[PDB]
Ligand SMILES: *[C@@H]1O[C@H](CO)[C@@H](O)[C@H](O)[C@H]1NC(C)=O
Ligand SMILES: [Ca+2]
């Protein structure tokens with residue numbers, strides 16, 4: 001294998017590195033996987049389809065302009081170069097290789113498109129028509145956007161967009177399911193908590209956080225239990241950033257944030273899908289859980305779950321490992337059909353006060369077709385009132401002892417509107433047996449005399465009843 005000769009490839013430290021602080025992409029390339037035959041679409045502010053490092057891979061069938069209702073996603077050019085983001089993201093996935101221009105995409109032989117959908121009024125219908133674009137042609141969708149990262153918002157997909165997620169994973173890609181890759185958020189400065197973002201908190205999105213070059217939690221990071229894994233992105237000014245295609249046929253070395261991490265993940269997922277085109281949307285999440293690497297990512301909350309895997313709320317299961325992903329994909333056995341076990345926990349409303357603990361021992365639908373012995377995602381769907389929402393911290397403990405933070409204190413969230421059947425999601429108990437005692441903790445983290453009531457707690461378990469590995 002001959003590595004790319006592109007002029008900025010040496011600057012793509014998160015690929016070209018030789019000091020083990022990288023995404024192990026060369027190993028996949030050397031196995032013969034560069035993205036041939038895979039189609040990825042960037043859902044953002046447009047794509048410069050004539051960019052010298054994108055044109056060779058550009059796919060009009062992966063593209064649309066939902067803002068102006070036409071097929072051509074070319075960005076709107078302005079003095080401030082506002083609409084540059086989709087072009088930056090596209091090059092991370094699929095910039096052309098060995099052409100003397102800028103660097104390379106992770107999947108530099110994949111086909112790449114863009115949906116111009118952020119440059120206008122972004123309605124539920126706009127989101128739904130973007131997520132649902134050409135779903136039997138596009139394999140993988142990448143979205144580096146979501147609800148305002150102000151640390152006070154709780155919001156997620158409305159009805160059309162949620163319907164688009166369920167149609168995508170159910171009937172998309174020939175019934176194997178659209179793969180929706182999501183950036184977990186850029187609200188770290190505001191102490192945002194990313195389970196309050198219903199796009200990344202969805203089970204249907206493969207949510208990705210960031211690590212800095214030196215292996216630390218970047219300033220912009222949001223911790224939450226819904227995140228699955230991590231890719232490198234930007235950090236402090238001594239740390240390098242992401243190198244990619246830029247608006248006006250240029251090359252940038254300064255792409256940043258979790259917005260840059262999701263496209264890198266989408267590229268790795270494209271290499272993985274080339275290695276096994278029959279992988280389902282759930283198969284792909286299993287591969288990420290099994291192969292991602294904690295090593296040398298620094299966080300104070302690394303914990304070993306019930307099947308021996310290390311998990312962090314900043315990083316999920318750790319750094320994506322492209323070589324390991326493509327290797328495991330090749331002989332992967334399709335997982336069994338997804339089961340869903342619904343457990344209504346409360347028999348009466350519960351005053352929260354300073355602190356509330358709810359314990360329930362469950363059988364996880366024993367004796368039923370939805371019996372689960374091998375968890376995937378779990379949700380605590382909570383309905384509660386509280387006078388100051390951001391003073392709450394919420395934890396969920398699995399029978400195996402895995403403590404998932406469902407919500408951390410958000411100092412800027414003054415809302416009195418509580419949570420209305422909000423489906424807080426955790427990936428941290430993946431592959432555990434969910435039978436036994438679950439514990440919900442709700443705590444007032446302030447000294448104020450706050451008050452409210454928990455009126456509904458639905459524990460929703462997803463998973464199967466077959467095929468477990470020996471614990472790590
Ligand atoms: C894909 O997986 C399904 C489920 O295991 C199987 O029935 C089908 O034969 C597979 N198709 C290919 C092309 O491997
Ligand atoms: Ca257009």
Ligand SMILES: [Ca+2]
Nearest residue numbers: 006096101103
């Ligand atoms: Ca190039």
Ligand SMILES: [Ca+2]
Nearest residue numbers: 149185187192
């Ligand atoms: Ca956020």
Ligand SMILES: [Cl-]
Nearest residue numbers: 166340460462
């Ligand atoms: Cl469901």
Ligand code: NA
Nearest residue numbers: 155156157158
């Ligand atoms: Na919404």
Ligand code: NA
Nearest residue numbers: 200202205207
């Ligand atoms: Na998600």
Ligand code: NA
Nearest residue numbers: 399433435436
């Ligand atoms: Na148990």
